[PDB]
C-alpha cells in the first residue's frame, strides 16, 4: 500500500 503513501512523499 506504498502507492498511496508514495504519492504524498513524492
Swiss-Prot record:
Q: Does the keyword Transmembrane helix apply?
A: no
Keyword annotations: Antimicrobial, Fungicide
GO BP annotation list: defense response to fungus; killing of cells of another organism
- Describe the function of this protein: The synthetic peptide has antifungal activity against B.cinerea (MIC=20 uM), F.oxysporum (MIC=20 uM), A.niger (MIC=41 uM), C.albicans strain 01U (MIC=13 uM), C.albicans strain 38U (MIC=7 uM), C.parapsilosis (MIC=105 uM), C.neoformans strain L26 (MIC=209 uM), C.neoformans strain L30 (MIC=209 uM) and T.rubrum (MIC=3 uM). Has no antibacterial or cytotoxic activity.
Q: Which branch of life, at top level?
A: Eukaryota
- Its name, as the record gives it, is Antifungal peptide
Amino acid at each position: 500500500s506504498r502507492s498511496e503513501l508514495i504519492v504524498h512523499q513524492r
